[PDB]
């Protein structure tokens, strides 16, 4: 009985920003989702099409876990169908989703006394994100008719703003580490059972 690695995607020392989230393919496991559901440390455990008590009695083919760090007030936008600055431009979930969104407070780790400017998010885009698509393109969007050659004074605005993370912000503006488990069932032998 070899259990599945959840101990490097949950309690990791440093996650990634929301505009470049970490996608980790999990396969050939025996997972234990009941240890996750009865941990009493997460603040948001919402499953969106499966039952959380019947997670162990399911055989999938791949499980994909997406880790990122957002504000506490923006964990609502990791729902199927919701909109906002995060669901439109950073991380879009489709409205046929089958997975469980997990989140917990992380003010002790992702906040420094001067401000942690390591967590970025995308401010605008050309069009909305079709679901499960990342876009890491640091281009200055060229508003106006003159090629500005890599400046930020007038138009030619930068597309990525940094999160302002202090330890005195508010329980909705503290950094909430979010991991999104997504279950996929292809036409293949099922190996992730539990």
């Amino acid at each position, epitope marked *: 009985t070899n259990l599945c690695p959840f101990g490097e995607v949950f309690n990791a020392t440093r996650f990634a920003s929301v505009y470049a989230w970490n996608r980790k393919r999990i396969s050939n496991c025996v997972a234990d989702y009941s240890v996750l559901y009865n941990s009493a440390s997460f603040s948001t455990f919402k499953c969106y099409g499966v039952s959380p008590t019947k997670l162990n009695d399911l055989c999938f083919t791949n499980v994909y876990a997406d880790s990122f760090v957002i504000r506490g007030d923006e964990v609502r936008q990791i729902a199927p169908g919701q909109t906002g600055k995060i669901a439109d431009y950073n991380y879009k979930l489709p409205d046929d989703f089958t997975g469980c969104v997990i989140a917990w407070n992380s003010n002790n780790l992702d906040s420094k006394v001067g401000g942690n400017y390591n967590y970025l998010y995308r401010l605008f885009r050309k069009s909305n994100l079709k679901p499960f698509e990342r876009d890491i393109s640091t281009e200055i969007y060229q*508003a*106006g008719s003159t090629p500005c050659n890599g400046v*930020e*004074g007038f*138009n030619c605005y930068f597309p990525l703003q940094s999160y302002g993370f202090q330890p005195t912000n508010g329980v909705g503006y503290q950094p909430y580490r979010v991991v999104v488990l997504s279950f996929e069932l292809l036409h293949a032998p099922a190996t992730v059972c539990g």
Partner: antibody
Amino acid sequence: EVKLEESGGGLVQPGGSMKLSCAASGFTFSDAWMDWVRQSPEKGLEWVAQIRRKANNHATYYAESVKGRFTISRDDSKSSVYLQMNSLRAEDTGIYYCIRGMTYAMDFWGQGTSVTVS
Amino acid sequence: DIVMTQFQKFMSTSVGDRVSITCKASQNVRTAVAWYQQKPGQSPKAMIYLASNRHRGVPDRFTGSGCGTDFTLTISNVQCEDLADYFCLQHRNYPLTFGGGTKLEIK
């Protein structure tokens, strides 16, 4: 609190000179692109000049109606921008507003300063 | 220079209606149009930047959309707070020209 206040409220004979000053505080004055816009009762809103931020070589862009009669100069150490006007005319009448940064966020405007000619 | 034509100088709508102010242009300014509200006796406060985004502290009623040449700023549930002038300007090329202005008065 972000605030911008102007000076130089008076009347001049056509042929004098008047140097308006816009003192700003409450934000980082190094990276801000500050224009000067004009409101006259006959011609509506107009646009006079523009000084840019420090990383763009302190560029100056004037409208083509005020070339050679209008210079703009900023100083980030005293946190103020100046609009020096020389050889004025009859259609330079109006109110001159000093703004923080136009056409993006932090789009604050001043309060203005009445400039008239006789 | 790029000129903004704003042919409605007087719009007469009652309380709680929907008004749509248009700002025609003469050449294809892409998305670079800002909208300004000037209450009588003050300086213009910014409403819309880059023709679709909304500022901080402005209500949800103030929305503007459109690209190309013919832009619009549509307000809904017109209160008594919105008795002012509405200007539009383009900022693609450096002769930045404002609009004419659209004054609202309550019926």
